[PDB]
Design a protein around this ligand. Structure first.
Ligand SMILES: O=C(NC1Cc2ccccc2C1)c1nccnc1NC(=O)N1CCCCC1
Ligand code: PRO
Ligand SMILES: [Cl-]
Ligand SMILES: [Zn+2]
Length: 480
């Protein structure tokens, strides 16, 4: 066991990630491959995301619920290799296997069919916070790629396509708000290609995040328009209020956001000193550490409690580390590893001078702040830390996302650690050829068709394959 980190983020990113998530007390490993323990330091971030997102969807009329985890084989057949099957209880074998949900479309929609008789029963907007299981045999990674993960999943059903199309973008923007405003992570809004869209849906919208350390992208969240494909599978129908006799199928959406958010936060903002928490999601925004007798020792404790109560009065999540068995230097390293945005340091000389040293986690700057200006200055520093983290991550993404129009430039830019927007024909066969040619997975797959591309096509613009014309500028790159 060692004091600080041992692996540089730019040297061994895998070892760096494992050291950051464990020494920040976020992740503990489990004896089942692909499953990881969420320690309170990690789970508190998820609770911050949950508190924000849950209040926002309720403002939109979505209500919470809980559907069973187990799916009958019959329900799944209405619509495979990553689904986990329960086959016995104790020593007795079940009559037939039952599946653990990888997603709850086939669980809820049989119930949706019973609840919809007329168009007045629509819309139905439900969300549940729960766990799903996707038992893939690919290489797992904590937070990012796990066999079990926590998420929310929203499932809406409307009578018109126009209501559904509007919610898809509304939910997607809330997902962007979670990454941009809470996690200080920039994302690219876009549409998945036909190959990468949700199976059984019409179109899939997504937010793509970029990990600069690896040059790989990852899907931060998704919002599907299922159209009428699932309402035809489960007979979610209603009598047409404008045409008697004929029946209509409901238009549906589904949208999900997982704990992968936390791992992206770690990969983007974490440095060689450990984790870095955005002040918006840090359960401890300011940690007070006494610095520099037995009565003078009690003096530092009283002043640390005074700053603690004053910060609580201005709604600043503050905690004081008054433990007598750890030296100040140890606490400096400890709370630096955990990513607390501000380390409030109070010593004997600073206290007698009505001062204290505030250390920004993002930049390491030591700011000497007077006692009278404690509430206002610490709020300004917290605000500037959130802005700085987002601005640096934003310009990092902008400089690593460029445009290429030939496979030669595509490959050269891809090898420099960037993601590229290329003229793409949209076909699945060409997308497979792009991944195979760029692999020589090390190959590039499609990320999204950007809502706002960097440039536009022109009449006669050919795809990178050269055989089909280009339909849209599409973002490609190596992915998680
Ligand atoms: O897809 C995940 N895991 C599977 C891929 C993989 C790779 C290696 C080993 C096992 C597995 C299972 C995932 N894992 C953790 C957290 N979020 C995850 N998913 C998502 O964030 N998205 C976007 C939102 C809708 C759902 C999909
Ligand atoms: O798994 C998915 O991608 C969608 C979104 C949450 C529910 N089903
Ligand atoms: Cl919960
Ligand atoms: Zn093509």
């Amino acid at each position: 066991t060692r004091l600080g980190l041992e692996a540089k983020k730019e040297e061994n990113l895998a070892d760096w990630y494992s050291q950051v998530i464990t020494k920040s007390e976020m992740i503990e490993y489990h004896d089942i491959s692909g499953c990881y323990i969420l320690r309170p330091w990690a789970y508190a971030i998820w609770e911050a995301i949950k508190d924000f997102f849950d209040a926002e969807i309720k403002k939109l009329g979505v209500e919470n619920c809980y559907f069973p985890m187990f799916v009958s084989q019959s329900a799944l057949e209405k619509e495979a290799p990553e689904v986990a099957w329960v086959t016995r209880s104790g020593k007795t074998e079940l009559a037939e296997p039952i599946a653990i949900r990888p997603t709850s479309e086939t669980v809820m929609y049989p119930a949706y069919a019973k609840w919809v008789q007329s168009h007045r029963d629509l819309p139905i907007k439900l969300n549940q916070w729960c766990n799903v299981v996707r038992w893939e045999f690919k290489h797992p990674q904590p937070f990012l790629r796990t066999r079990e993960f926590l998420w929310q999943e929203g499932h809406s059903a409307f009578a018109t396509m126009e209501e559904a199309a509007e919610e898809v973008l509304q939910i997607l923007d809330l997902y962007a708000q979670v990454y941009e405003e809470l996690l200080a992570i920039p994302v690219v809004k876009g549409r998945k290609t036909e190959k990468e869209k949700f199976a059984g849906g019409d179109y899939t919208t997504t937010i793509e995040a970029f990990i600069s350390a690896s040059g790989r992208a990852i899907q931060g969240g998704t919002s599907h328009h299922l159209g009428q494909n699932f309402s035809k599978m489960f007979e979610i129908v209603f009598e047409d209020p404008k045409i008697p006799g004929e029946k209509q199928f409901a238009y549906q959406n589904s949208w999900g956001l997982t704990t992968r958010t936390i791992g992206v936060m770690t990969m983007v903002h974490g440095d060689n000193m450990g984790l870095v928490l955005p002040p918006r999601v840090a359960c401890v925004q300011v940690v007070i550490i006494p610095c520099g007798s037995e009565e003078d020792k009690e003096a530092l404790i009283a002043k640390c409690n005074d700053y603690r109560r004053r910060l609580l009065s201005v709604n600043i999540r503050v905690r004081a580390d008054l433990r007598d068995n750890y030296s100040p230097g140890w606490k400096f390293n400890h709370w630096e590893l955990k990513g607390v945005p501000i380390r409030l340091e109070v010593g004997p000389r600073d206290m007698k001078s009505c001062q204290f040293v505030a250390v920004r986690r993002d930049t390491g700057e030591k700011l000497t702040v007077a006692e009278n200006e404690a509430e206002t200055k610490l709020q300004a520093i917290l605000e500037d830390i959130q802005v700085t983290l987002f601005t640096r991550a934003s310009e990092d993404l902008k400089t690593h996302m460029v445009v290429a129009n030939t496979m030669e430039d595509f490959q050269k830019i891809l090898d420099s650690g960037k993601i590229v927007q290329i003229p793409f024909c949209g076909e699945i066969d060409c997308e497979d050829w792009i991944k195979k040619t760029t692999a020589r997975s090390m190959g590039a797959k499609s990320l999204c068709i950007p809502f706002k591309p960097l440039c536009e096509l022109q009449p006669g613009a050919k795809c990178v394959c050269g055989k089909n014309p280009a339909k849209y500028y599409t973002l490609f790159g190596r992915s998680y």
